[PDB]
Design an enzyme around this catalytic site. Structure first.
Site, mmCIF file in Angstrom:
data_model
loop_
_atom_site.group_PDB
_atom_site.id
_atom_site.type_symbol
_atom_site.label_atom_id
_atom_site.label_comp_id
_atom_site.label_asym_id
_atom_site.label_seq_id
_atom_site.Cartn_x
_atom_site.Cartn_y
_atom_site.Cartn_z
ATOM 1 N N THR A 80 17.124 4.049 -101.565
ATOM 2 C CA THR A 80 15.947 4.626 -100.926
ATOM 3 C C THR A 80 15.482 5.985 -101.466
ATOM 4 O OG1 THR A 80 16.405 3.273 -99.016
ATOM 5 C CG2 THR A 80 14.978 5.165 -98.663
ATOM 6 N N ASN B 107 21.915 7.800 -103.341
ATOM 7 C CA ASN B 107 21.882 8.188 -101.942
ATOM 8 C C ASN B 107 23.035 9.148 -101.628
ATOM 9 O OD1 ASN B 107 19.514 6.868 -101.066
ATOM 10 N ND2 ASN B 107 20.656 5.052 -100.350
ATOM 11 N N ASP C 46 9.913 0.705 -101.441
ATOM 12 C CA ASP C 46 10.813 1.427 -102.334
ATOM 13 C C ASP C 46 11.786 0.528 -103.130
ATOM 14 O OD1 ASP C 46 12.258 0.675 -100.065
ATOM 15 O OD2 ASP C 46 12.771 2.745 -99.489
ATOM 16 N N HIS C 47 12.187 -0.613 -102.557
ATOM 17 C CA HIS C 47 13.111 -1.571 -103.209
ATOM 18 C C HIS C 47 13.153 -2.790 -102.317
ATOM 19 C CE1 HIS C 47 15.749 -0.471 -99.918
ATOM 20 N NE2 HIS C 47 15.600 0.797 -100.265
ATOM 21 N N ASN D 267 22.851 12.274 -127.528
ATOM 22 C CA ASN D 267 22.903 13.070 -126.289
ATOM 23 C C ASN D 267 22.296 12.323 -125.084
ATOM 24 O OD1 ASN D 267 20.177 13.297 -126.986
ATOM 25 N ND2 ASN D 267 20.159 15.537 -126.846
HETATM 26 C C1 LIG Z 1 13.505 8.601 -95.738
HETATM 27 N N1 LIG Z 1 12.521 9.128 -94.798
HETATM 28 C C2 LIG Z 1 11.304 9.717 -95.099
HETATM 29 C C3 LIG Z 1 10.763 9.986 -96.453
HETATM 30 C C4 LIG Z 1 9.429 9.691 -96.789
HETATM 31 C C5 LIG Z 1 8.984 9.976 -98.065
HETATM 32 O O1 LIG Z 1 7.712 9.674 -98.436
HETATM 33 C C6 LIG Z 1 6.942 8.848 -97.569
HETATM 34 C C7 LIG Z 1 5.856 8.202 -98.438
HETATM 35 C C8 LIG Z 1 5.588 8.987 -99.724
HETATM 36 C C9 LIG Z 1 6.269 7.618 -99.795
HETATM 37 C C10 LIG Z 1 9.818 10.592 -99.021
HETATM 38 C C11 LIG Z 1 9.348 10.892 -100.310
HETATM 39 C C12 LIG Z 1 10.177 11.473 -101.219
HETATM 40 C C13 LIG Z 1 11.496 11.793 -100.877
HETATM 41 C C14 LIG Z 1 11.990 11.516 -99.639
HETATM 42 C C15 LIG Z 1 11.154 10.899 -98.680
HETATM 43 C C16 LIG Z 1 11.608 10.595 -97.387
HETATM 44 N N2 LIG Z 1 10.720 10.069 -93.971
HETATM 45 N N3 LIG Z 1 11.550 9.664 -92.909
HETATM 46 C C17 LIG Z 1 12.653 9.113 -93.454
HETATM 47 O O2 LIG Z 1 13.600 8.656 -92.851
HETATM 48 CA CA LIG Z 2 18.364 12.292 -127.927
HETATM 49 CL CL LIG Z 3 24.334 5.977 -104.483
HETATM 50 ZN ZN LIG Z 4 18.777 0.182 -97.165
#
Ligand SMILES: Cn1c(-c2cc(OCC3CC3)c3ccccc3c2)n[nH]c1=O
Ligand SMILES: [Ca+2]
Ligand SMILES: [Cl-]
Ligand SMILES: [Zn+2]
Ligand SMILES: *[C@@H]1O[C@H](CO)[C@@H](O[C@@H]2O[C@H](CO)[C@@H](O[C@@H]3O[C@H](CO[C@H]4O[C@H](CO)[C@@H](O)[C@H](O[C@H]5O[C@H](CO)[C@@H](O)[C@H](O)[C@@H]5O[C@H]5O[C@H](CO)[C@@H](O)[C@H](O)[C@@H]5O)[C@@H]4O)[C@@H](O)[C@H](O[C@H]4O[C@H](CO)[C@@H](O)[C@H](O)[C@@H]4O[C@H]4O[C@H](CO)[C@@H](O)[C@H](O)[C@@H]4O)[C@@H]3O)[C@H](O)[C@H]2NC(C)=O)[C@H](O)[C@H]1NC(C)=O
Ligand code: NA
Ligand code: NA
Length: 806
Positions: free
Chosen positions: A159, A180, A308-309, A685
């Site tokens: 995530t 994570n 996200d996945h 590298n």
């Molecule tokens: C993981 N999580 C987030 C949450 C929501 C995010 O973006 C929402 C949309 C842009 C894609 C995020 C974007 C980037 C990094 C962490 C994030 C976490 N909010 N609440 C929660 O549990």
């Molecule tokens: Ca290189």
């Molecule tokens: Cl991980």
């Molecule tokens: Zn999950």
């Protein structure tokens, strides 16, 4: 300390976060345990639910209510989302025919169409088709807007890495969120899902979209939502922000749903319990669209629906245990689950040795469900090495499986039925993309693409200049009605030399021999024309690659192939040739088995030498243009030139010979001819970028011949395979690989068998994008085609995955 005695009156979901001990009323305060005392009462109202009802219509405003059904609610921007449906006889958005949105239809004072990013956790790509019946709002977005069959996440398919890649356009190795869970040895600190450390800004690199927007004068709603804030409240808050005055109103918004991921883990991607979470998500979408329609914003906003996945079937019984392989299991730390990362339990352990750990984990059980790697040997398409938070030892786990250190970790820490994290080309990990609004195309399907490309597009949608990132800006122009980004091809930095015949045979003392001194104005004029480039239009179909750095190199022409020969690295940077459907494979004649011939166009001083290979007992050599595919017995001598030779371990030659002798012909037969460009890569590298001369860690013994870390090939043909590769009128088709140049085949557990049983499988694992090869070589391909540059950019980002249908 937070003196939570201040107030959230008039401050609910404040955009600008306040500094402790001043209590907070922003959509993250819950997470920091720092909300003001009256936060719940004022900001998380629930009274009367989330829907208007016939009797509530026209009601006197009651500020305790969760949303409103009074006459003034629309101007106040806090009606329940079904207000006009229930009270004013309007239709739900989902029940309206879709109509092309040719131009933004926005209220006066909107300077640009807002962008709303609606992100769903664990939303597997196949849910779009398989759940279509229970998701009518999402199905309307998908069919009426622009959609891909699936969107490829980044590795690991977890995530945080993926949400932060969405926000930044960067690979996890560059943005720093590499899992994570992470240990950073420089900070000596750990990052975990639970807890406070993840909020420290030092974890988060690059420049996320909200910062990009702010720095350029575009206001942003807050992206992160505390888990306890109900989804209905998140939506109503977005709708309220969109009702702010012009000077305060954000232009970009994010919604986040923890579903369907949360249920997916418990019940598996397709458990019967999954229907309800998909219904609930679709209901949230409908609340958003009904709410937009009430504000007359439903043909003004661009909406992105993105995952996200995906999610795979994974249960406790499909766990491999390191304790079944290692005797030293307590001297290591494993980051466990759908990937593995191993480091020493204690840095004071002088006896710890990654080489013996790798060896004890390599091909030990017949159906072993994970494969160990030094991180620099991972498939380059994963871009998963160049960060100190990535442990040297990595385990790629088979889909449907987990790795754990000891059985006690699994039964003392079956619950779950689903998980994710696997290799990002695995079908079950694919996710979704739909774009809907005035800036997206109407009723359009686009090919699958990678989530690293979205940041650029969201920048394009907001009129922002993107920070430097790993997307290829322009490669998603075909998603967009307008605001396309029209890049120019990079300028060539080094021009080539075109050497003629300049050296006599006897000037070469390279320890090379060839039985070639066996002897006509018909065909002597003919051979000189080939060396002047008379067949180059056949073998260089898309123009020569441009060299994008300063170096010294030569173009060498031949009957069957053309090459750009580096005087610095003593070998070609690229070799290009076309093999028609009709071409024939021949063998290397006996008299030419160990033949290497001096190239009279290229000084002895800029040439490889055979004695170095003789002396190097570990290193052998191969050829970039395969002698097996020469057009005639006389043309075959060209393939034995010292300038066509490259250093290859014997183990690697097994791979290379099967590709050149068998697979090229096979592709030419299946694709109606192929053009091939092959070459070396040096990435000592493991940063994914071309090494300079001073970064090379290994040479052929006693020489300045540098050893490549990888060999690439780019195999191009006509997308309409009824046209031969050399006579193609329209779009192209490509597949490419970046094969690791390794002194053993330990990676391939079946390598003692015939190459036909294991080489293709290795090649499939090391599939690549042209763009990956560009980064690694500093070359720019497809300079001279009849195609639009954006279309070529899309081709350059294509990955051939070898997965069955989605
Ligand atoms: C993981 N999580 C987030 C949450 C929501 C995010 O973006 C929402 C949309 C842009 C894609 C995020 C974007 C980037 C990094 C962490 C994030 C976490 N909010 N609440 C929660 O549990
Ligand atoms: Ca290189
Ligand atoms: Cl991980
Ligand atoms: Zn999950
Ligand atoms: C994907 O896209 C991204 C983005 O375009 C590409 O990543 C870039 O690669 C660039 C080329 O390598 C790299 O440029 C270097 O920047 C150095 C300064 O960087 C800092 O500032 C920027 C801008 O604000 C910032 O983004 C950086 O953030 C990184 O580091 C912090 C850690 O503090 C992280 O929080 C963050 O996540 C990010 O980490 C990632 O990048 C670093 C490398 O910078 C990695 O080490 C991490 O693992 C992680 O991947 C920084 O805060 C600058 O110092 C470099 O300059 C050196 O080299 C040049 C060569 O031209 C030379 O001119 C200079 O002299 C200098 O050498 C001197 O220092 C050397 C080392 O100390 C020393 O050996 C020499 O002797 C010299 O004294 C260099 O210009 C750029 O930072 C990153 N950007 C990002 C965001 O990652 C990436 O390549 C793309 N990937 C692919 C496959 O295409
Ligand atoms: Na040798
Ligand atoms: Na093997």
């Amino acid at each position: 300390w937070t003196a939570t005695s201040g107030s959230c009156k008039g401050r609910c979901f404040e955009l600008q976060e306040v500094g402790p001990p001043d209590c907070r009323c922003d959509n993250l305060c819950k997470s920091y345990s720092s909300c003001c005392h009256d936060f719940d009462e004022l900001c998380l109202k629930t009274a009367r639910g989330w829907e208007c009802t016939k009797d509530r219509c026209g009601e006197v405003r009651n500020e305790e209510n969760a949303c409103h059904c009074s006459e003034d609610c629309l101007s106040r921007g806090d009606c329940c989302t079904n207000y006009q449906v229930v009270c004013k006889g309007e239709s739900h958005w989902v029940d309206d025919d879709c109509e092309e949105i040719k131009v933004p239809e926005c209220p006066a004072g909107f300077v640009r169409p807002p962008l709303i990013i609606f992100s769903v956790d664990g939303f597997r790509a196949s849910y779009m088709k398989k759940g279509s019946k229970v998701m009518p709002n999402i199905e309307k977005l998908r069919s009426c807007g622009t959609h891909a069959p699936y969107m490829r996440p980044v590795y690991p398919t977890k995530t945080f890495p993926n949400l932060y890649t969405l926000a930044t356009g960067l690979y996890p190795e560059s943005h720093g969120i590499v899992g994570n869970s992470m240990y950073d040895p420089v900070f000596d600190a750990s990052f975990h899902l639970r807890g406070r450390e993840k909020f420290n800004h030092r974890w988060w690199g690059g420049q996320p979209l909200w910062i990009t927007a702010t720095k350029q004068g575009v206001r942003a709603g807050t992206f992160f939502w505390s888990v306890s804030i109900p989804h209905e409240r998140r939506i109503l808050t977005i709708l309220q922000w969109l009702s702010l005055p012009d000077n305060e109103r954000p232009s970009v918004y994010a919604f986040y749903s923890e579903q369907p991921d949360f249920s997916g883990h418990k019940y598996g991607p397709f458990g019967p319990e999954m229907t309800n979470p998909l219904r609930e998500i679709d209901k949230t979408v409908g609340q958003l669209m009904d709410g937009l329609k009430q504000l007359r914003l439903h043909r003004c906003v661009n909406v992105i629906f993105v995952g996200d996945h995906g999610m795979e079937d994974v249960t406790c019984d499909r766990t491999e245990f390191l304790s079944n392989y290692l005797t030293n299991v307590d001297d290591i730390t494993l980051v466990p689950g759908t990937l593995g990362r191993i480091r020493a339990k204690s840095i004071n352990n002088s006896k710890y040795d990654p080489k013996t750990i790798i060896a004890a984990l390599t091909c030990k059980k017949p159906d072993q469900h994970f494969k160990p790697y030094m991180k620099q040997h991972l498939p380059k398409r994963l871009h998963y090495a160049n960060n100190r938070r990535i442990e040297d030892i990595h385990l790629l786990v088979d889909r449907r499986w987990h790795v754990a250190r000891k059985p006690l970790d699994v039964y003392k820490k079956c619950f779950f039925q689903g998980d994710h994290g696997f290799d990002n080309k695995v079908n079950s990990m694919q996710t979704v993309f739909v774009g809907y609004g005035p800036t997206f195309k109407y009723r359009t399907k686009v090919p699958p693409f990678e989530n690293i490309e979205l940041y650029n597009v969201m920048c394009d949608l907001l009129g922002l200049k993107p920070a430097p990132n790993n997307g290829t800006h322009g490669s998603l122009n075909h998603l967009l009605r307008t605001n396309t980004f029209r890049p120019t091809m990079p300028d060539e930095v080094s021009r080539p030399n075109y050497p003629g015949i300049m050296y006599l045979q006897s000037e070469f003392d390279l320890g090379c021999t060839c039985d070639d001194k066996v002897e006509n104005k018909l065909e002597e004029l003919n051979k000189r024309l080939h060396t002047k480039g008379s067949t180059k239009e056949r073998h260089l179909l898309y123009g020569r690659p441009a060299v994008l750095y300063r170096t010294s190199y030569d173009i060498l022409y031949h009957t069957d192939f053309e090459s750009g020969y580096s005087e610095i690295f003593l070998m070609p940077l690229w070799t290009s040739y076309t093999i028609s459907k009709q071409a024939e494979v021949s063998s290397i004649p006996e008299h030419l088995t160990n033949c290497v011939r001096p190239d009279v166009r290229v000084s002895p001083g800029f040439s490889q030498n055979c004695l170095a290979y003789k002396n190097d007992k570990q290193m052998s050599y191969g050829f970039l243009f395969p002698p097996y595919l020469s057009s005639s017995p006389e043309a075959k001598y060209d393939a034995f030139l010292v300038t066509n030779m490259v250093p290859m371990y014997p183990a690697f030659k097994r791979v290379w010979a099967y590709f050149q002798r068998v697979l090229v012909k096979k592709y030419a037969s299946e694709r109606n001819g192929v053009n091939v460009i092959s070459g070396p890569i040096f990435d000592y590298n493991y940063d994914g970028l071309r090494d300079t001369e001073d970064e090379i860690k290994q040479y052929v013994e006693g020489s300045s011949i540098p050893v490549p870390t990888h060999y690439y090939s780019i195999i191009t043909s006509c997308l309409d395979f009824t046209q031969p590769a050399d006579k193609c009128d329209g779009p192209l088709s490509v597949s490419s690989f970046i094969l690791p140049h390794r002194p053993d085949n330990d990676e391939s557990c079946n390598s003692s068998e015939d190459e036909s049983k294991w080489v293709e499988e290795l090649m499939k694992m090391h599939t690549a994008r042209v763009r990956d090869i560009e980064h690694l070589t500093g070359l720019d391909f497809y300079r001279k085609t009849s195609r639009s540059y954006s279309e070529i950019l899309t081709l350059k980002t294509y990955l051939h995955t070898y997965e069955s249908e989605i």
